[PDB]
């Protein structure tokens, strides 16, 4: 419910609710429902794979209630550029790390 921090970069979604409990007085409960979706096998620099494996996973509930992040969005795209010899001339060519998300 009250969780307008559905930022799908760090995966967080910590919503709030009130146990309409057993009909005693306002002996109610306040919750904070986290669901972090760790990529774990992803890379440190999210747009460049040459960076080492991202091992540590920091989670502050301050910046995720709005940056480097861990996963890929379906509505955004991340791209990259690559070279090649083919003999002498080297020409930069554009590739997309997110297919079916930004395919021309």
């Amino acid at each position: 419910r009250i969780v307008l921090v559905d930022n799908k970069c760090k995966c967080a979604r910590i919503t709030s609710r009130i146990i309409r409990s057993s009909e005693d007085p306002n002996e109610d409960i306040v919750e904070r429902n986290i669901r972090i979706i760790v990529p774990l096998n992803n890379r440190e620099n999210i747009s460049d794979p040459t960076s080492p494996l991202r091992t540590r996973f920091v989670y502050h509930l301050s910046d995720l209630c709005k940056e480097t992040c861990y996963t890929y969005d379906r509505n955004k795209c991340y791209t990259a550029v690559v070279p090649l010899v083919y003999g002498g001339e080297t020409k930069m060519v554009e590739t997309a790390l997110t297919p079916d998300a930004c395919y021309p």
Binding site: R43, R56, P104
Partner: protein
């Protein structure tokens, strides 16, 4: 005596920025005055060739006749013909190149497999492969690179495209490198790129290192913090 009918490769077409069809003569005697010309399906002649090269150490001559044709006419499947005429053969020999319509266009699937674990036990080499499959019967050339500097074909070797078991006409091909084991042991992240027509941007890419292939030991630590916030 033999004559070839070599269409420009897809890689040549979209990397050299110049589309030209060439026909090569081989296995013949080292003579001259080899009339090697390109003509169209209507019999009209095409622009001639340049830079007649030198023969082979095997005492056999080698010459090439090249014609420059734009991309759209090549995609039009026009019946181009290379004629080779010489005193060796009383009848000029004709080679036909065209684009036969009637093949569906299928996106290539390019997959990277690093060497097995027990491959890294003989401590002499690491064999990485990229396998392309399911693509349209158009045949393509492959490039590889390491740490951003691409590599020569003297090390990595590709395979001829063969039909797939269950596909009607979708093909497949392989490419492998056997590199020093210490290199792949000491990072040196490798990348296989290929260029095929069915690709949206015409070029696709994949990359592998030790980290990518089967991480056998993590220490992931989800240190949630300021849990209140």
């Amino acid at each position: 005596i033999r004559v070839f009918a070599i269409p420009p490769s897809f890689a040549s077409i979209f990397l050299t920025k110049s589309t030209k069809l060439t026909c090569l003569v081989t296995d013949l005697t080292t003579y001259d005055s080899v009339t090697i010309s390109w003509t169209r399906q209507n019999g009209e002649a095409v622009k001639t060739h340049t830079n007649i090269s030198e023969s082979h150490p095997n005492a056999t001559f080698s010459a090439v006749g090249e014609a420059s044709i734009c991309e759209d006419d090549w995609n039009s499947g026009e019946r181009f013909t290379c004629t080779v005429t010489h005193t060796d053969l009383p009848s000029p020999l004709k080679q036909t190149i065209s684009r036969p319509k009637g093949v569906a266009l299928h996106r290539p699937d390019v997959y990277l497999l690093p060497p097995a674990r027990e491959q890294l036990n003989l401590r002499e080499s690491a064999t990485i492969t990229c396998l392309v499959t399911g693509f349209s019967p158009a045949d393509v050339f492959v490039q590889w690179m390491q740490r951003g500097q691409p590599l020569s074909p003297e090390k990595y070797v590709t395979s001829a495209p063969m039909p797939e078991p269950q596909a009607p006409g979708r093909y497949f091909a392989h490419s492998i490198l056997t590199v020093s084991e210490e290199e792949w042991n000491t990072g040196e992240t490798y990348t296989c790129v290929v260029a095929h027509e069915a690709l949206p941007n015409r070029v696709t890419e994949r990359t592998v290192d030790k980290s990518t292939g089967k991480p056998t030991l993590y220490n992931v630590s989800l240190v949630m913090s300021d849990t209140a916030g």
